[PDB]
RNA sequence: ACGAGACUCUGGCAUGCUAACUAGUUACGCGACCAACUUCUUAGAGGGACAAGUGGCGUUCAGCCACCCGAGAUUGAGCAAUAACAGGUCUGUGAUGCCCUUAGAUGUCCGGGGCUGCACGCGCGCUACACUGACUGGCUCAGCGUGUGCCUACCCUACGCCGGCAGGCGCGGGUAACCCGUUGAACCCCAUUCGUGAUGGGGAUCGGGGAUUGCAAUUAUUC
């Protein structure tokens, strides 16, 4: 399964709430900005966080999400 | 403008080279050729009769890989299973008295000779002679 | 006397000529790379020697 | 339990089964071996003799199925 | 590619009486000292080819092989091709023939029984003489 | 001034030394279709007749072919022909002819650019092999 | 000859690469031609042992590993310079061997 | 050696010899009849093809017409649409037997 | 807050990067018209994959299924939560708490019976059914790894005596990407072949040719 754990989910939520300015819709740009503005100690976890950030950006482009 | 002897597929190339070496007519095989098993992986004896000729050309190519050519590296081309009853396998080879007799029949042919440090070496003059023969049988009556 | 008995026919494969360098035990010897420890003593000292578990 | 076939070469009987191969729609060593129930190597020898007669051309060789054809 | 030889419904070589059903020249199991690499070596020494038709092969080649085996020591050909070599009672390898004689001499068990040895009983009972293990595996030999 | 990525697959390889000259194609180090194993000649016959002589009329090729394994060096010859053609047309003429002819060759079949990632896996814990286990008694 | 070789061996790659970069930088500070670091295939030492001290339980094994990484750098300089560059307060674990061959 | 088109038999025995239904197990027990089902044709046709692999083998296995020489029959087993096969009519006997449950 | 995940190691991918006199090479190159700023192998600071894109199911949430693209789309292992068990180990350890035998010390000394039986009392093991199994020796094959003094007297191996090759003796190389070795009595293939299956097709013992040299081997070594 591909269920994201609390680590990547919470990191994505914080990154979106705090740097909503810079994040977009592209995985590559989200990856680069996530690497810049956060100290993610693993590259797999960084990629997972960036992917969930892209997913949540799509979510919030279509309305408000509670997290 | 300079022909390599490894220019055609080696089946017919060694076939024609052996045809030349048997057409010289001065060399007849001794009586210790086929009754030797050499290695176990075979079931039969040499039957082609040009086995000596192939051994020498293959040995030349072996150098086209490295100096001091010897038979075990030459015979490592086909490995895998060798089920030998109640004992595990080995790694192919032949016989050394066969090699010595082939050397006794090989002197005066300028094809393959030993060296002073252990192993074999190439005879450049005979090399050029066989290159010329192969090239001028290729470019006279094989591609016109 | 002493030389009439000792060193007559070579024992070329003495198991009792080897012992663990930590506890002087006969069995479970690890002679590879020159450890010369029994396997239990090696497991105790594996990390200090430099052998570590990866796979 | 191999069958019994007439293999003897005679003044008459020899020239009665050698001109029966081209009397069939499907003429291959496989068809002859499965239908006329004689060794397929005999049919291979027959086609080799046909090649010796000079009415076909040999292309490739195999222990079971050989290639002999014509372009005329 | 034709031969005027006539098919023979009865053929006789070494007075054997066995069921002739299959082809020949490698079902020579009735013949004791021909076949495989040695027969190949002899035939290649005779300079003959395979340009004829299989199925109908006569027995002259193997007759020539036995003829050369009648005097094999003259040409100094590698002499590890006979069955029982370096046996007692002779320093050479003599001739024998007929079935019902060879299978016994595959086990020359008179002197080894006379010497009062375990080897005679090891061989006699149909069991091991070298020690093939016989309790879970190694049960073949009587079935 | 060094444009080479040669031709490899699985275990074998072939150094694609592609240079401008007279323009004759050297393949197999031997005549075209007589390879001694004989098993897979016809796959080599697809592109050389598909594309044409004029496309490969200037390609002087010198390849060191090695490696045992049919599926390795075979189909690596086709990977090498496609890739050498790609690099030649890219660095010498343009990109449009490259995309056209390369598209033809790699749209004939996909398996060129991708080899099997399958490898023998480790003998595992308390068993004869990777997954098989020794027989358990009770 | 003036061909001197330095062979660097350690069980870890971080310190070995740090030492290699340090020595390359030092040989490039002076105007010296240096053959780039050449990496040996890093032979791996394996010792597989039963986990149990007794012979009881499921047959479980430890798979111990020890990897030795070997690099050699070639440059042309007399012995005094090599002796000076060695005395750099080296980090532990990187065994340095210098041969004048 | 053909020159003409083998297409007729080449298609017309096997590639619509194919059956139309196989069966499945019923309830939790009882090995005396089987509930008739089907699949989108691929699985049933190629199950007939697999039983035909066994059948053509046994037509070679300990038999006279061997492997590497059944090319006609294999092209039949390959191409397209009509009915003459054997293991497929075995499958069709099973077809009717299990189809009596509709 | 642990455990799970993350993590570490390992595979799989570079018309990319860092460079190698042990792999690899360009028209003032020969032994041949009759000193490429490093890429196949080796290994490093990096890159690459995220259910990321699309379609469909899902209080349109978590997510699931499929499909392009792709080297790769639940991808080998290692590590692994207190309470647990009178689980095993005192025969791995001057790691360790004392009720307590014997002189036939559970010390030595190529020394020395068995267990290498055969009505089996049980358990782990040694093995493929046909043109696929194996020979023509007629084309460049694999490793994963090991290899010589604190102890110590024991390492891996490259030609000839020559019956037909390990090899009883002289001989060099390698503390090793330098030698064995581009792994020296091996593919699975094949002009020794099976025409419909007891034949050539895969071995029930068990005998000779010189035996690697281990007092013994038979009361376990050796084509």
Curated annotation (Swiss-Prot), chain A:
It is found in: Cytoplasm; Nucleus, Nucleolus. The modification N6-succinyllysine is found at residue 18. It is linked to Diamond-Blackfan anemia 4: A form of Diamond-Blackfan anemia, a congenital non-regenerative hypoplastic anemia that usually presents early in infancy. Diamond-Blackfan anemia is characterized by a moderate to severe macrocytic anemia, erythroblastopenia, and an increased risk of developing leukemia. 30 to 40% of Diamond-Blackfan anemia patients present with short stature and congenital anomalies, the most frequent being craniofacial (Pierre-Robin syndrome and cleft palate), thumb and urogenital anomalies. The chain holds residues 2 to 68 of 135 of the full protein. Belongs to the eukaryotic ribosomal protein eS17 family. This is Small ribosomal subunit protein eS17. Component of the small ribosomal subunit. Part of the small subunit (SSU) processome, composed of more than 70 proteins and the RNA chaperone small nucleolar RNA (snoRNA) U3.
Swiss-Prot record, chain B:
Disulfide bonds: none annotated. The modification N6-acetyllysine is found at residues 22, 110, 114. One of its GO terms (biological process) is translation. Belongs to the eukaryotic ribosomal protein eS19 family. This is Small ribosomal subunit protein eS19. PROSITE patterns: RIBOSOMAL_S19E. Component of the small ribosomal subunit. The ribosome is a large ribonucleoprotein complex responsible for the synthesis of proteins in the cell. Required for pre-rRNA processing and maturation of 40S ribosomal subunits. Part of the small subunit (SSU) processome, first precursor of the small eukaryotic ribosomal subunit. Higher level expression is seen in the colon carcinoma tissue than normal colon tissue. It comes from the Eukaryota.
Swiss-Prot record, chain D:
GO terms for molecular function: RNA binding; structural constituent of ribosome. GO terms for cellular component: cytoplasm; cytosol; cytosolic ribosome; cytosolic small ribosomal subunit; extracellular exosome; nucleolus; nucleoplasm; nucleus. It comes from the Eukaryota. Keywords: Acetylation, Cytoplasm, Ribonucleoprotein, Ribosomal protein. Signal peptide: none annotated. The modification N6-acetyllysine is found at residues 2, 11, 19, 25, 53. The modification N6-succinyllysine is found at residues 11, 53. It is found in: Cytoplasm. GO terms for biological process: cytoplasmic translation; ribosomal small subunit biogenesis; rRNA processing; translation. Component of the small ribosomal subunit. The ribosome is a large ribonucleoprotein complex responsible for the synthesis of proteins in the cell. Component of the small ribosomal subunit. Belongs to the eukaryotic ribosomal protein eS25 family. This is Small ribosomal subunit protein eS25. The gene is RPS25. The chain holds residues 42 to 113 of 125 of the full protein.
UniProtKB/Swiss-Prot annotation, chain G:
Disulfide bonds: none annotated. GO terms for molecular function: MDM2/MDM4 family protein binding; RNA binding; structural constituent of ribosome; ubiquitin ligase inhibitor activity. It comes from the Eukaryota. GO terms for cellular component: cytoplasm; cytosol; cytosolic ribosome; cytosolic small ribosomal subunit; extracellular exosome; membrane; nucleoplasm; synapse. Polyubiquitinated by ZNF598 via 'Lys-63'-linked ubiquitin chains when a ribosome has stalled, initiating the ribosome quality control (RQC) pathway to degrade the potentially detrimental aberrant nascent polypeptide. Deubiquitinated by OTUD3 and USP21, antagonizing ZNF598 activity. The modification Phosphoserine is found at residue 77. The modification N6-acetyllysine is found at residues 18, 59. GO terms for biological process: cytoplasmic translation; positive regulation of signal transduction by p53 class mediator; translation. It is found in: Cytoplasm. Keywords: Acetylation, Cytoplasm, Isopeptide bond, Phosphoprotein, Ribonucleoprotein, Ribosomal protein, Ubl conjugation. Component of the 40S small ribosomal subunit. Belongs to the universal ribosomal protein uS10 family. Component of the small ribosomal subunit. The ribosome is a large ribonucleoprotein complex responsible for the synthesis of proteins in the cell. This is Small ribosomal subunit protein uS10. The lineage of its organism: Eukaryota, Metazoa, Chordata, Craniata, Vertebrata. The chain holds residues 17 to 117 of 119 of the full protein.
């Amino acid at each position: 399964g591909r269920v994201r754990t609390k680590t990547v989910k919470k990191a994505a939520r914080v990154i979106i709430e705090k740097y909503y300015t810079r994040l977009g819709n592209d995985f590559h740009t989200n990856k680069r900005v996530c690497e810049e503005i956060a100290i993610i100690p693993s590259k797999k976890l960084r990629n997972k966080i960036a992917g969930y950030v892209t997913h949540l950006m799509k979510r919030i482009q279509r309305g408000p999400v509670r997290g | 403008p300079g022909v390599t002897v490894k220019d055609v597929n080696q089946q017919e190339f060694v076939r024609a080279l052996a045809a030349f070496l048997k057409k010289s007519g001065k060399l007849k095989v001794p009586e210790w050729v086929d009754t030797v098993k050499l290695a176990k992986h075979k079931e039969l004896a040499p039957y082609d009769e040009n086995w000596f000729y192939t051994r020498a050309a293959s040995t030349a190519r072996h150098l086209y890989l490295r100096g001091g050519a010897g038979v075990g590296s030459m015979t490592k081309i086909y490995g895998g299973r060798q089920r030998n009853g109640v004992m595990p396998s080995h790694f192919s080879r032949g016989s050394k008295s066969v090699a010595r007799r082939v050397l006794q029949a090989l002197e005066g042919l300028k094809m393959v000779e030993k060296d002073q440090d252990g192993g074999r070496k190439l005879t450049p003059q005979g090399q050029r002679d066989l290159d010329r023969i192969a090239g001028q049988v290729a470019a006279a009556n094989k591609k016109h | 006397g002493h030389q009439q008995l000792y060193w007559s026919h070579p024992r070329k494969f003495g198991q009792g000529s080897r012992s663990c360098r930590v506890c002087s035990n006969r069995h479970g010897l690890i002679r590879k790379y020159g450890l010369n420890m029994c396997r239990q003593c090696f497991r105790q000292y594996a990390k200090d020697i430099g052998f570590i578990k990866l796979d | 339990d191999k069958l019994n076939n007439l293999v003897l070469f005679d003044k008459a009987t020899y020239d009665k089964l050698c001109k029966e191969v081209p009397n069939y729609k499907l003429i291959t060593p496989a068809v002859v071996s499965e239908r006329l129930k004689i060794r397929g190597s005999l049919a291979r020898a027959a086609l080799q003799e046909l090649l010796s007669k000079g009415l076909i051309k040999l292309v490739s060789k195999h222990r079971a199925q050989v290639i002999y054809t014509r372009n005329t | 590619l034709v031969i005027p030889e006539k098919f023979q419904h009865i053929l006789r070589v070494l007075n054997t009486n066995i069921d002739g059903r299959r082809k020949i020249a490698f079902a020579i199991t009735a013949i004791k000292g021909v076949g495989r690499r040695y027969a190949h070596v002899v035939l290649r020494k005779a300079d003959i080819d395979l340009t004829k038709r299989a199925g109908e092969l006569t027995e002259d080649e193997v007759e020539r092989v036995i003829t050369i085996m009648q005097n094999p020591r003259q040409y100094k050909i590698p002499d590890w091709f006979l069955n029982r070599q370096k046996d007692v009672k002779d320093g050479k390898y003599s001739q024998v023939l007929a079935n019902g004689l060879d299978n016994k001499l595959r086990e020359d068990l008179e002197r080894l029984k006379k010497i009062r040895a375990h080897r005679g009983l090891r061989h006699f009972w149909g069991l091991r003489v070298r020690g093939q293990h016989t309790k879970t595996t190694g049960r073949r030999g009587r079935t | 001034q060094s444009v080479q990525v040669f031709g490899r697959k699985k275990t074998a390889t072939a150094v694609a030394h592609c240079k401008r000259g007279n323009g004759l194609i050297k393949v197999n180090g031997r005549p075209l279709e007589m390879i001694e194993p004989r098993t897979l000649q016809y796959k080599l016959l697809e592109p050389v007749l598909l594309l044409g002589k004029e496309r490969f009329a200037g390609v002087d090729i010198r390849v060191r072919v090695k490696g045992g394994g049919h599926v390795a060096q075979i189909y690596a010859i086709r990977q090498s022909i496609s890739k050498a053609l790609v690099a030649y047309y890219q660095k010498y003429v343009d990109e449009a002819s490259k995309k056209e002819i390369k598209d033809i060759l790699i749209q004939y079949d996909r398996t060129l650019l991708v080899a099997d990632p399958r490898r023998c896996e480790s003998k595992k814990f308390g068993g004869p092999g990777a997954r098989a286990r020794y027989q358990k008694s009770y | 000859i003036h061909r001197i070789r330095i062979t660097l061996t350690s069980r870890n790659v971080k310190s070995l690469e740090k030492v290699c970069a340090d020595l390359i930088r030092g040989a490039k500070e002076k105007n010296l031609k240096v053959k780039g670091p050449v990496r040996m295939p890093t032979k791996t030492l394996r010792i597989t042992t039963r986990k149990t001290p007794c012979g009881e339980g499921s047959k479980t094994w430890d798979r111990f590993q020890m990897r030795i990484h070997k690099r050699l750098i070639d440059l042309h300089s007399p012995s005094e310079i090599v002796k000076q560059i060695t005395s750099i307060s080296i980090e532990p674990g990187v065994e340095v061997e210098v041969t004048i061959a | 050696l053909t020159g003409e088109n083998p297409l007729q038999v080449l298609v017309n025995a096997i590639i619509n010899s194919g059956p139309r239904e196989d069966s499945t197990r019923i309830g939790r027990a009882g090995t005396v009849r089987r509930q008739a089902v089907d699949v989108s044709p691929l699985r049933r046709v190629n199950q007939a093809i697999w039983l035909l692999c066994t059948g053509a083998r046994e037509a070679a296995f300990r038999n006279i017409k061997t492997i590497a020489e059944c090319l006609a029959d294999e092209l039949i087993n390959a191409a397209k649409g009509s009915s003459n096969s054997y293991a497929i009519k075995k499958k069709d006997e099973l077809e009717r037997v299990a189809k009596s449950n509709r």
